[PDB]
């Protein structure tokens, strides 16, 4: 099948015009929306863009129509949030979760299908491995088209956070995370900066 | 809405013969099946019905038809399996897992819809809260139709597993549990087996 590792949503500019292409990317979950009829997840790696718009650079659709597919969407979202500790209305009373990175770091590794037609592209999720903050920290310390890309992306995003953190202009701050933590503080300082 | 707590799947016998009824139950996950067209989760509380036919008392359909819904079943299965550490085949090349309780104890609280028609009934998953073992150990220390049933239900299940473990005819043994643990040996042979 040859799934392709995508380091940057920028990658998709020079992707085919009318194609189905299996990809994989490693990013922070930043937004979730679930409405009457739509379900979105947005993710970002926060690569210095320009640095115009840094959140939700990856928009993944969970298409649904009838009531079964809607439920499955809700259950996916619910499990996803449960893993990352995100608080959610109880089924028995929409979901707007933006800027999830300001409260929680929710590293995710995602398999999606890139689908391009009529001069635009869309991303449909096929899988998602939520990644645990400690494992992500530990690690920083099969298609032929992927291999040790996990490491590099995780290293980049965290360097990108180090720049957003100390940037007076950016709302993100390490200390503002809910799970802010001795382990985190040391990681951010111990070597991350010295590197 | 009046979601109803269900302590036993036996309850569903005297349920209306043609309705949609929202229920909630607490069981161990015992099986997953994913095929080309179907996706089933089996659960059990292990009540002595009994000493004859004990796993998969509850069968929960995750219905799909198109490719989008199939993906959503896969993503759901994946996340659930990930929360409980169940190893799954990689997506890039069906799932058959039975008697999951031989290896992992995967407590779950489930919200389903009970849907009876033509003399028969089926349960459609709406939510699922995978429950952590340490927390289930800790606990054992709203609609108007749910009480404090969680605890009662967890206590019974553990009461059943204890009986299952000393049963020479039942394959279940605590020691053979992958996550066998100093804390579990205590809880098992400490009070539960003393009360």
Curated annotation (Swiss-Prot), chains A, B:
Changing residue 131 to S: Disrupts interaction with POL1 but not FUN12. It is found in: Chromosome, Telomere. Interacts with POL1, EST1, FUN12, STM1, STN1 and TEN1. Single-stranded telomeric DNA-binding protein that regulates telomere replication. Has a role in both positive and negative regulation. Promotes [TG(1-3)] strand lengthening via interaction with EST1. Promotes [C(1-3)A] strand re-synthesis by DNA polymerase alpha via interaction with POL1. Negatively regulates telomere elongation of the G strand via binding with STN1 thereby inhibiting telomerase activity. Present with 319 molecules/cell in log phase SD medium. This is Cell division control protein 13. It comes from Saccharomyces cerevisiae (strain ATCC 204508 / S288c). The lineage of its organism: Eukaryota, Fungi, Dikarya, Ascomycota, Saccharomycotina. The chain holds residues 13 to 224 of 924 of the full protein.
